Design a binder for this molecule. Sequence first.
Ligand SMILES: O=c1[nH]cnc2c(C[N@@H+]3C[C@H](CO)[C@@H](O)C3)c[nH]c12
Ligand SMILES: O=c1[nH]cnc2c(C[N@H+]3C[C@H](CO)[C@@H](O)C3)c[nH]c12
Lengths: 263, 302, 278
Amino acid sequence: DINEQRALIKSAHRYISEKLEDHFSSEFLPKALVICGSGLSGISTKIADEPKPLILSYSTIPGFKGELIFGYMNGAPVVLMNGRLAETVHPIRALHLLGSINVLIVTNAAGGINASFKAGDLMCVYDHINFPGLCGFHPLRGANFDEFGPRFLATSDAYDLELRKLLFSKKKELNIERKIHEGTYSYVHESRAESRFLRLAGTDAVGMSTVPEVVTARHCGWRVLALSLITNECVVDPPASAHDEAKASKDVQELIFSVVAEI
Amino acid sequence: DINEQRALIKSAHRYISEKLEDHFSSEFLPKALVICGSGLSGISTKIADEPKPLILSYSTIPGFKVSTVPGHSGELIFGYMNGAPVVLMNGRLHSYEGHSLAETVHPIRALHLLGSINVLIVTNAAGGINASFKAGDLMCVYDHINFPGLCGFHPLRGANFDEFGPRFLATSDAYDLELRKLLFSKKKELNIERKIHEGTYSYVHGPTFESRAESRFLRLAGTDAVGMSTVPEVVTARHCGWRVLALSLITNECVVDPPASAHDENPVPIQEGKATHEEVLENSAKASKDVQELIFSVVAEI
Amino acid sequence: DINEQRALIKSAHRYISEKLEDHFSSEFLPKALVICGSGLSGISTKIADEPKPLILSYSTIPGFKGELIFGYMNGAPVVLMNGRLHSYEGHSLAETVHPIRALHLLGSINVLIVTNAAGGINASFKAGDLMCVYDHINFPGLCGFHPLDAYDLELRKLLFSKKKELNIERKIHEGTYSYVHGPTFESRAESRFLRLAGTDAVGMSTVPEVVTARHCGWRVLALSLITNECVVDPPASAHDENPVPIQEGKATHEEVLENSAKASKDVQELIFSVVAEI
Ligand SMILES: O=c1[nH]cnc2c(C[N@@H+]3C[C@H](CO)[C@@H](O)C3)c[nH]c12
Ligand SMILES: O=c1[nH]cnc2c(C[N@H+]3C[C@H](CO)[C@@H](O)C3)c[nH]c12
């Protein structure tokens, strides 16, 4: 089970590393993996046309259940995951074997739970609640990959302070007027009562991605920067009583483009 | 399948029972199962040399799964502690290792069939969520939160073992009052100064330590200490009709403050105070002698 | 699995549809499905004698893991589910809602009326009160357990108008039902948690049926019978010299069944009145 998972991770790396060497004139050693969430596939446009980026379809990569994009962004070599529990984070581990990536930048679309948030706002993630992981669906469940990281991983330090300071500094410099908050992302696998529960539980934004990748990247020792696009404000007010009578993506693109040059 | 689970339970029992009958000259009828938590395997040193104890490796008993952790694979130790026949589970299984909850509590079912055990004494290490707790303190468990259980991961899911207990088990009475009073009486008798709080333990799956927001969530939900075991064993023992005494060692203080903000002028490093397994083990080791002596005293009076 | 799940649902519909054709002289097209929860089998007595109702045991219907009763109630053609399935029994959520998906294929049902027993979490509720459900919290759904605006306002108003018309004194609250997996009754700390989470009543069923009915395009009316008041007080401390016994007030299935049966006549009268205006 872990033996087969290890072999598939090594096969994926083996394949990827070979394709890089055949494609690039110099060693390609990406400093970051960028995961483009829903509606944010335009991050790819920010990849320079020279040298010609390398594109591998997931179908072609051993053990990948979409495409991987290898190229330069603002002078830095990166990999983009265009589209996306053990198997869902397999790509992170396969890419870790390249031995160059030290930052995961992950973007997603999320529902606004914090009452201050409005659609179109951004939220830099500085904490998370991994609801399925508290219960029994967890990317690290099973035998530990001892070569990658520890059996018991702290997550109180999951969201790098310097990367967050960097993101905000870059926003003020490109003078982006879009609202950006800092808060807690809750991962779940939506009623008024459930949204109310999420709010009182401490949720600022909610969605069904990101956290398993953040946990897996942290397990590998990477730094993590995570950014949510608030697509809508969830309603928390009770139903009526029977007794009664893509502008965002553009901004995300430029933020990330700026960020990676200092990564 | 339940008829498959019954067969595995009956098989484990038969193996264990036959081992005992061949090892001890008097019928061995343990009154308590003691489950030893992280860093507390020292409890086994309280088993007397005479009569010779019996040690059964998990790897040799049907249905038992071994730890994925080397080389602590886990063993059942049958012997006399302070004159009382007991069985110790030296090592427990955790669901984060990849075992089903049913697998982690199978030994309780198998041992129930000996027909003598009426008390579970369960120990564990836990992170302190209650702000007043400090590493080194003990907490006597008088209540729990089974959040994974509410959400679909429950050791009693499936056809009910009607031979053992009710389809619908109350848990508002899970933590016997007289055993908790016994525990505190022994603290007094032994002049142990270590604090023993009383409070609520929450089971979470792991294997990550909790984020700040998760810990804040557990806190607002009423958690005093958090760990990755114990609750499914308690529930299963209760299903079998045993009384339960549960004792947590607070091995670390969960970090619950919001992380440094990007806007903060003098930020606290987000790594400050982070939990590590090494801190848990070293703190378990420091408190082990007190835990050993408390249990040694308790088993003579059950 | 999925293109085969579809086959089992069609197989169930074929079985049922032919049994109905064989049984009734005129086309029988039920407009409501009533799911009879814990201790509420008495609904069956409200089915009229003429035309004779058809009973189908769950054991003879393809894919069903109880009985289905097809007949007229207060002039309305309905189906009753006498017995429901629960995830704590080891059944997948898909298996627990299979009967709804099969019956949807008749193309005639447009209302689910679902009843259940529930523990009272709201401090003001008493055993014997009813609660009309207007919202829910799906706890297993947080982890992705899933069978595949929910609770019709006009049906809720209809329920209250019938309580008034029938002079039923029994209290009917309106509030939030929390679905938790079971099969244990909640600990004191768990019940206090549910209360702070916004729960008014707690139970181990219903939500997956509601979600499935909505997916099939049906309106939903859900009624909980409060059968017991959940214990919330912290248990006796070892330091208390005058402790309240930890067993005091504990939930039992016996209490649930007895209290379900006591409220059953009122619930039957309500549902009987409602289906005629569905
Ligand atoms: O206090 C409660 N907690 C959770 N569920 C129920 C229920 C509902 N049903 C009743 C049945 C156990 O009596 C089981 O299927 C859950 C009644 N009271 C409670
Ligand atoms: O802060 C905590 N959170 C969750 N569990 C534990 C435990 C119990 N542990 C011990 C072990 C990790 O150190 C693992 O099996 C769960 C001690 N401290 C904490």
